[model samples]
Target: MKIAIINMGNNVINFKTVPSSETIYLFKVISEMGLNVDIISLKNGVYTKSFDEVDVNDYDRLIVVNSKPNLAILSAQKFMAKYKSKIYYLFTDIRLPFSQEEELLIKSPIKVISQGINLDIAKAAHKKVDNVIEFEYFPIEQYKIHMNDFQLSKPTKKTLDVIYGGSFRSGQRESKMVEFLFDTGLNIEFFGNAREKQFKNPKYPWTKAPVFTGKIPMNMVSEKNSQAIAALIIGDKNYNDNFITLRVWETMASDAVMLIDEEFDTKHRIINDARFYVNNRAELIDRVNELKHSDVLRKEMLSIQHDILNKTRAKKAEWQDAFKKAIDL
Candidate 1:
């Protein structure tokens, strides 16, 4: 199946904070699915780069990766019509349903909804309300190819560690995670900001590190993450049910033992194993204590790591099989 992926606002290289990896991973995944993936991006951040030539009539599927907002431009609607039933719009950022526009946009009937964050928006967009079909930002293929080297048997660094790398959206969960981890007596080191309140000389005192990069560059964070004994991540519940993020695959790519907070949809869809969740400080403490001491526990836990979705582009095709099914290709 032939598939065309367009970043069509500008090549991601100029993205101020866009993770260049999201598009790359999506391409890899789709191509791996034995589908042809062609990408077209705006020369200077405008979607109307070359409307005269992009005819999607020949492709099995057409998808737009909207890393940039304001993608609801008029050109998008016209461009989408070229593919008719095959064109899909993918949003890789979070948006709030603040107005009637959002409420209506979310009601958009698409063959599949591909979103980055804001699963709720995607859910509202998919035919099945509150359920979205999403894609990855980077290939788990990177993890799969590098598996033997990454899934280390021994700890790479010293003294108990827990590192988190994400936006400090500064919500209750933001504060709760830190207090919970610290009170549990796990050797805790957190990364990200908006935590002045958590760090204030009040309740818990765990080491905190500033996020070195608000957005990570390719292959840059793995070494630091490798040394981390355990990594904890909480999904933005704003999007309750859509898809997993790059962190899930990237953590595995770095071979770190991670304790994810929760899942969307069914149990196995998010990940292949059970992760830690703290209903309260006590439960969090127990899980940390359990994970800290037992090598047997660690081995059993690590065994649950999900393999990269695709081995190689040829080993598994990402978009083609689905495109064939969706269109009569």
Candidate 2:
């Protein structure tokens, strides 16, 4: 079956060293399936207003991989009546556990996929249809399809230190955590973009804490895993309940033991006592110091991390399977 994937805005928000967009991996999956797969960006070429321009007749199915659902739904509605065949929409970001977006889209005839954690949000939003399913899958290579292209910066401060990086911001809990980290003065480095003003002008509690090192291309930062004592991923309150973001897998893939904030799902899905879920800074520090010297423990975690990377690595036909499932023509 010929498949088309539409997500015009993905590139706008992606990390440069990562694949150009999420579609790179999705297309990888579809391409492996031995099917004609087409991907379109949401941004129009040179100030284009629309993200897609397709002749529906050429494809057997269309998968709207992702976009702001409100906007994507509007686009889907425009063509719903025109095509009488298979179609699907995987809500990549289940808005929230208490969201109302999914249910609202039930009126449209398309299959719905939700994160297992947020399926209830979809059901609560659409009480009538019983189409919710746990998200037990994602194509493996999709995680870092462009890893080799993006160069991680060569290690500068090569010491037994921990590295923490990703897109983040400071808020109530964030402010508290920053204070703890700063007060502890542990061997940790902060990465990602943060507002100096939000962290300073209106000091939330961590006004005196160290600032983020700023955003760096993944190529520059990716190789730091080997130098890491153990990578820590502490999300806000959201980390404990919902699915944590790419940081979890990305860190592990880099051979750094992943230390996460306590979450049942996090502990369960990312096996390995190598995955440490901490509630406070003391425990976070304890884990860091413990793993820094234990080459045995480090090797264990790195081996597991590499296993995950190998499993998720680009395969001969992984994308094709995904594209085949994404279609509704």
Candidate 3:
């Protein structure tokens, strides 16, 4: 059957910027299912076909990635009105206590395939809660694609103490953690779309300077991450225990040890043993110092993380099976 994967979220599908992990994962898995698939996105002011112009009869199924409530709900309503059950709402990111419009969309007849915490929210909001299926993010395939040439050997030299390679939003926990680390004089660096405007406060004197290396291509992330003693995977204020990012798995695939904020460790899952989980600035400092002082400890942590990652990759087929079932393929 043919499927049209419609992105109503960020323009990551057609843009030159870094690809969204969720988008890449969906495309890869759907194409591998032996079904014809096409990506349709409302590109920066351009649409492959205007939403109303899309002929729903052209494909057997439509999977809409929901983002902005207004646009997504409008498109979703139109598609559901035209094709009904053929359309699936895939919620990748969601905040609790849905907006009035979001409640209306969720209560619609369109079935939902939700990710992480979004699954819970979707279930609570939907009229028929049983219509929702959970599809968690597992990025082993992405890890393999990016780390195809990666050698398991230890890096000959570690340049940075800690490295964070994502955008920095002011007033978020991630930015605060970075600032704290920077003040401690650790060789920390920030990459991605970070600008001085966001970090130029007198409170963070060092941040007023060029601590940011700017955006790094997605292809080069593995290399850059491996150069540091530890890679930071802190989440923002909206972080939940169930929400996991692509960076978590990407760091596991690299030689650098994963240093995540304790917010992700509230459940005490297997990931707890795979990396260092720090609660505050003091804990983070201690963890960084421990890793820096002991090569054996660092290697052991990396080895443990790799083993867990390999085990996770082994279950890719199971995840694919669940995904197929979720969309009723």
Which candidate leads in TM-score? Answer: 3
lDDT of 2 by residue, 1-329 (tens): 66666552244223342434455555654555566766644445431123357665566776655435456445544444354454555554543221223423423355554433444554554454443422323333343443444222232344646677754445644554564455555666666765444445346444245445777755444565556666766655433444545555567666466666654345555555534566666877777776766878756766765665556554535443553443422
The runs of at least 3 residues in candidate 3 whose Cα sits more than 4 Å from the true structure, single-residue gaps closed, are: 10-15, 19-25, 41-54, 66-81, 95-108, 122-156, 178-180, 200-210
Q: Regarding TM-score, does 2 or 3 come out ahead?
A: 3
In model 1, the Cα lDDT at residue 200 comes to 59
The CA lDDT at 264 in model 2 is: 32
Residue pairs with clashing backbones, model 3: none
For 1-329, candidate 3 gives per-residue lDDT tens digits of: 77777665444443354444456556656777566776655432331444555676677787776444456445545444455444566654544222224423533345555555544545554543433333333322333423334434356478888887876656665356454556666787777877556665565455323267877766567678888898877756544575566677777777788887776657755375634787766777788899999989988888888887777766656766766676677
Off by over 4 Å in 2: 8-20, 41-53, 67-83, 96-107, 115-118, 122-142, 145-157, 169-180, 200-204, 218-221, 236-244, 264-267, 311-329
How close is every model to the real structure, measured as TM-score? 0.63, 0.69, 0.75
Error of 2 at 139 (Å): 6.4
Worst 10 residues of 3 by lDDT: 95-104
lDDT of residue 274 for candidate 2: 38
lDDT of each: 0.49, 0.52, 0.61
Better of 1 and 2 by lDDT: 2
